[PDB]
Amino acid sequence: MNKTLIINAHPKVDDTSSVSIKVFKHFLESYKELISNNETIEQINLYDDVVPMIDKTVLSAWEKQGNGQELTREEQKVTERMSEILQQFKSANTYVIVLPLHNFNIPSKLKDYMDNIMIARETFKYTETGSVGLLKDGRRMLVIQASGGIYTNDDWYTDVEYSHKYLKAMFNFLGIEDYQIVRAQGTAVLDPTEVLQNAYKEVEEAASRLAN
Amino acid sequence: NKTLIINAHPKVDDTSSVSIKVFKHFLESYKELISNNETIEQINLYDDVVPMIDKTVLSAWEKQGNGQELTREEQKVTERMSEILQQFKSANTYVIVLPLHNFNIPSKLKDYMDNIMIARETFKYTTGSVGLLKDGRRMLVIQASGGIYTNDDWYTDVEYSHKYLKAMFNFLGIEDYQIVRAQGTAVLDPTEVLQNAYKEVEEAASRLAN
Ligand SMILES: Cc1cc2nc3c(=O)[nH]c(=O)nc-3n(C[C@H](O)[C@H](O)[C@H](O)COP(=O)(O)O)c2cc1C
Numbered sequence: 432m433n434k435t436l437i438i439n440a441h442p443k444v445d446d447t448s449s450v451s452i453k454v455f456k457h458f459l460e461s462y463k464e465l466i467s468n469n470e471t472i473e474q475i476n477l478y479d480d481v482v483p484m485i486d487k488t489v490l491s492a493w494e495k496q497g498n499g500q501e502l503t504r505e506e507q508k509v510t511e512r513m514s515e516i517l518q519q520f521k522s523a524n525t526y527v528i529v530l531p532l533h534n535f536n537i538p539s540k541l542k543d544y545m546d547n548i549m550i551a552r553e554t555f556k557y558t559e560t561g562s563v564g565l566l567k568d569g570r571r572m573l574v575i576q577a578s579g580g581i582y583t584n585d586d587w588y589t590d591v592e593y594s595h596k597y598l599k600a601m602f603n604f605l606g607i608e609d610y611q612i613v614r615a616q617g618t619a620v621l622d623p624t625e626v627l628q629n630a631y632k633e634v635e636e637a638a639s640r641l642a643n
Numbered sequence: 644n645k646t647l648i649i650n651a652h653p654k655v656d657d658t659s660s661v662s663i664k665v666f667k668h669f670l671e672s673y674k675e676l677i678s679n680n681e682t683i684e685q686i687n688l689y690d691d692v693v694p695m696i697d698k699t700v701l702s703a704w705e706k707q708g709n710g711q712e713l714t715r716e717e718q719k720v721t722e723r724m725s726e727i728l729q730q731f732k733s734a735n736t737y738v739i740v741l742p743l744h745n746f747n748i749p750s751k752l753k754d755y756m757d758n759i760m761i762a763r764e765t766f767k768y769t770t771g772s773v774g775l776l777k778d779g780r781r782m783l784v785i786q787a788s789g790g791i792y793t794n795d796d797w798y799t800d801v802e803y804s805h806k807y808l809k810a811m812f813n814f815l816g817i818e819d820y821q822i823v824r825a826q827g828t829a830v831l832d833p834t835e836v837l838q839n840a841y842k843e844v845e846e847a848a849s850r851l852a853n
C-alpha cells in the first residue's frame with residue numbers, strides 16, 4: 432500500500448502568509464500532478480486536530496496497561512486517540528513534515544506528536560544491546576522548515592539547529608534513512624524572492640523524487 | 644533575591660517520580676540553608692497556564708508590530724505571556740525539573756521557552772545576538788532518564804533535552820549551568836540512582852545557598 436502522510440506542525444495551519452505553508456502548498460501541487468491513483472494522501476494538522484500530550488492521565492493509563500488494570504473512561508479516551516495517531520503514522524510510507532523554526536527546536540505540538548508515535552514494540556523495540564527502530568522498510572521523509580536565520584554556513588547557527596538535528600536523529604533511529612530537509616532559510620536576511628524561488632525549486636525536485 | 648523553580652513534570656507532585664523525589668530532596672536542603680529575606684517561587688508547567696505559540700499569539704505579535712489594535716483574546720494571551728517573562732526575569736536562581744521523554748524537553752517546557760525567549764527582554768538582536776541576563780544568574784537542571792547519558796556514545800549524542808537547555812540559557816547569558824542526571828532508572832536499582840542524585844542536589848543546594 433502507498434500512502435503519504437502530511438504532518439503539518441504550523442500553528443497557522445493553512446494561512447498562506449506563512450513561508451513554510453506556501454512552500455508546502457507548492458510541494459503538494461507538484462506531488463499530486465505526479466502520483467498514481469493508487470496513492471492516498473492523509474494530513475494531520477497538529478494545531479487543529481486533537482494531538483494528546485503526555486500528561487498525568489496518559490502516564491497513569493500507560494502504568495495500568497503494564498499491570499493489566501482497568502482504565503478510567505478518561506484514560507481510555509486519551510489512549511484511544513493516541514492509538515489512532517500511531518496507527519495512522521505506521522500506515523504511511525511517505526511523510527512530509529511542515530514547520531516554522533521557533534526558538535531553535537521543534538514546535539511543542541510536534542513534540543506531542545513524537546510522543547504519540549515513538550512507542551515501544553510499535554515503532555522501535557528494546558534489545559540486549561539497546562534499542563532498534565522497527566520502521567526499516569524503505570520509508571521516506573521530507574521536512575519543510577522555514578527559518579529567519581541561515582543554518583548551512585557551519586557556524587553557531589548550525590550547532591543550535593536542534594529542530595533538524597532532533598527530527599533527523601529520531602526518524603533515522605525508527606528506521607527512516609531516506610530523509611530530506613528543505614530549508615526555506617534566511618527569511619530575516621534575504622530577499623523574499625530568493626528564499627521562495629529556491630524553496631519552490633527544491634520541493635519541486637522532492638515531489639518528482641518522491642512520486643517515483 | 645529570588646529562586647524560581649520551573650517544574651516541567653507532567654505528574655507535578657507525585658513522588659513516584661524520580662525527578663520529583665530528587666527535586667524535593669534538593670528543595671528541603673535548600674530551604675534549610677537560605678536566608679530569611681529570600682523568596683522561592685514555583686511554576687508547575689502542567690498545572691498552570693503557559694501559553695503556546697498558536698494563531699492567536701502570532702496574530703497578536705504581528706499586530707503589535709504594525710501598531711494595530713489587539714482583540715480581547717490577543718490582549719489576554721499576551722498579558723499572560725508578559726507575566727511569565729517578568730516572573731522569569733525577576734529571579735537569579737533557576738531550577739528546572741524534568742523527566743526525559745523521547746530525547747527532548749517536555750512539550751510544555753518548549754512552550755515555556757517560547758514565553759521567555761523574547762527580543763529586547765532576555766536577549767537582543769545586535770554584531771550578533773547577545774543575552775541580557777548576564778548578571779551572575781544560576782541554573783540547575785534536575786533530569787531523570789531511563790538511560791545513561793554520560794558514556795559518550797549514541798545516547799550522549801541524542802540527549803537533546805540537555806543540549807537545548809544549555810545552549811538556550813547560555814545564549815540568554817546564563818552561563819552558570821549545572822545538570823543533575825538521575826539517569827539509568829531503566830538499568831540500575833532505584834535506590835542506587837537516588838543515592839547518587841541526592842548527594843548531587845545536596846551539594847548543589849549548599850553551593851547555591853552560599
Ligand atoms: C516566536 C518566534 C521564534 C522564532 N525563532 C527563530 C529561531 O530560533 N531561529 C530562526 O532562524 N528563526 C526564528 N524565527 C523566525 C521564523 O523562523 C521565520 O519568521 C520563519 O519564516 C517563520 O516561518 P513561517 O513563515 O512559515 O511561519 C522565529 C519567529 C518567531 C515568531
Ligand SMILES: Cc1cc2nc3c(=O)[nH]c(=O)nc-3n(C[C@H](O)[C@H](O)[C@H](O)COP(=O)(O)O)c2cc1C
Pocket residue numbers: 485659660661662663741742743744745746747787788789790791828
Ligand atoms: C513516554 C516515555 C518516553 C521516554 N523516553 C526516554 C528517552 O527518550 N530516554 C531515556 O533515557 N528514558 C526515556 N524514558 C524513561 C524515563 O526517562 C524514566 O522512566 C525516568 O525515570 C522518568 O522520570 P520520572 O521518574 O521523574 O517520571 C521515557 C519514559 C516514558 C514514559
Ligand SMILES: [Zn+2]
Pocket residue numbers: 456457460
Ligand atoms: Zn505553486
Ligand SMILES: [Zn+2]
Pocket residue numbers: 690
Ligand atoms: Zn495543583
Ligand SMILES: [Zn+2]
Pocket residue numbers: 832833834
Ligand atoms: Zn532495591
